């Protein structure tokens, strides 16, 4: 079953993994942004 | 009459077996070792993921490594180009070297450096490297550039670094080099030494030999007699920790302090990650028994005179 995998989670690791600067600054992260941007997402990251 | 806690026999220390993990612990006796810290400006820390057996990719490339004690690397001089008398200040213990190191001091300038100490070397001993040539006083006393007899007596002392050419046949050396201007590569480990078999010399009919070739034959610690350069450096002596190979760790936890992790046999694995699980071979298919030689065929040894003697699996004792 599901586990409490977000117990003890910090919001600094959330910005380093799924932040905006982690994506504009990488070739593979620019694709995720454009995809979410082309779909209409407001929350492109974090 | 009561037996002491430390039981000294031979040159190996044993302790009272008051625990099952200290019964088989055996240590060599080296009480002369410097009990303080090393010369810091000659050391640097050994940290990072390379300590864990990882290469620049981050993936495990060396198995059974990681989790050992914090260490520092000792910058040891295996070239010894600088000439002049050097005074041994203290013999120290290096975690990353089997043999012991000596912190020498140049009497001319006072700069200190490390060198693999010989068997029997102690503080106060004066060592000298004649790799950069012979001084004027020594050269002038004989009156000739090279005299095969007097030179050996004044310079072939324990701990002196000389070209293999200047060393007489039958001398035991422990920092044998390969290239004319290369560092010591052979016999650097503890207790290891190499004898000089012969030299490419000619007779002048006056009883004085003179060098005519560019190489010399030396028997390495493995027994291989190979061609070594004429200017290759070599220190007279044997490495300090002769009894290193007689030690015993006694418990599994002392192997983990030495940065060694458990070795899982191939039989204890599944067939999905080892040929054995579920002839002897490694996890990747390399024959582990049968005499298969892993030296690349296209790499021929052009310096081999007498190769190593293969045991062919026969038991020794």
């Amino acid at each position: 079953g599901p586990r409490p995998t977000m117990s003890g989670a910090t919001r600094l690791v959330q910005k380093r993994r799924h932040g905006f600067l982690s994506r504009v600054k990488t070739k593979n992260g620019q694709k995720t942004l454009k995809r979410r941007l082309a779909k209409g997402r407001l929350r492109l990251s974090a | 009459i009561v037996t002491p806690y430390v039981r000294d026999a031979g040159m190996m220390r044993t302790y009272k077996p008051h625990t099952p993990g200290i019964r088989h612990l055996k240590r060599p006796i080296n009480d002369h070792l410097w009990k303080g810290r090393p010369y810091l400006p000659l050391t640097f820390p050994k940290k990072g993921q390379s300590k864990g057996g990882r290469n620049h990719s981050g993936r495990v490339t060396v198995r059974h490594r990681g989790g050992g004690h914090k260490r520092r690397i000792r910058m040891v001089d295996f070239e010894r180009w600088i000439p002049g008398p050097h005074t041994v200040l203290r013999i120290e213990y290096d975690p990353g070297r089997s043999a012991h190191i000596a912190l020498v001091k140049e009497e001319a300038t006072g700069r200190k450096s490390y060198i693999v100490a010989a068997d029997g070397m102690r503080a106060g001993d004066v060592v000298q490297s004649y790799r950069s040539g012979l001084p004027q006083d020594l050269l002038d006393s004989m009156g000739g550039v090279v005299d095969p007899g007097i030179l050996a007596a004044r310079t072939c002392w324990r701990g002196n670094c000389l070209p293999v050419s200047m060393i007489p046949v039958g001398t035991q050396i422990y920092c044998v080099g390969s290239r004319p201007d290369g560092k010591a590569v052979f016999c650097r480990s503890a207790g290891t030494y190499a004898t000089i078999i012969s030299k490419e010399e000619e007779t002048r009919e006056d009883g004085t030999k003179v060098m005519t070739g560019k190489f010399v034959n030396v028997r390495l610690q493995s027994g291989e007699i190979r061609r070594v350069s004429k200017d290759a450096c070599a220190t007279v002596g044997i490495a300090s920790n002769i009894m290193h190979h007689y030690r015993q760790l006694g418990k599994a936890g002392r192997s983990r302090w030495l940065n060694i992790r458990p070795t899982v046999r191939g039989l204890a694995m599944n067939a999905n990650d080892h040929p054995h699980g579920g002839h002897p071979v490694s996890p990747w298919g390399t024959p582990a028994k049968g005499g298969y030689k892993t030296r690349r065929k296209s790499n021929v040894n052009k310096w081999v005179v007498t190769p190593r003697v293969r045991n062919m699996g026969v038991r020794r004792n």
């Binding site: 977000m6 919001r11 600094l12 959330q14 | -």
Partner: protein
């Protein structure tokens, strides 16, 4: 954490070195020991 995690992060939420200004303007320079020297040429 379900929903609040998805809002825009502010300085009143985290403390581990996260700094964010209010665009009040630079009135000086930072020193090497953590102080601040007010350049009165930038003060308005």
């Amino acid at each position: 954490g379900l929903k609040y995690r998805k809002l825009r992060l502010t300085t009143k939420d985290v403390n581990k070195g996260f700094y964010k200004g209010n665009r009040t303007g630079s009135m000086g320079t930072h020193t090497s020991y953590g102080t601040y020297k007010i350049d009165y040429t930038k003060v308005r």
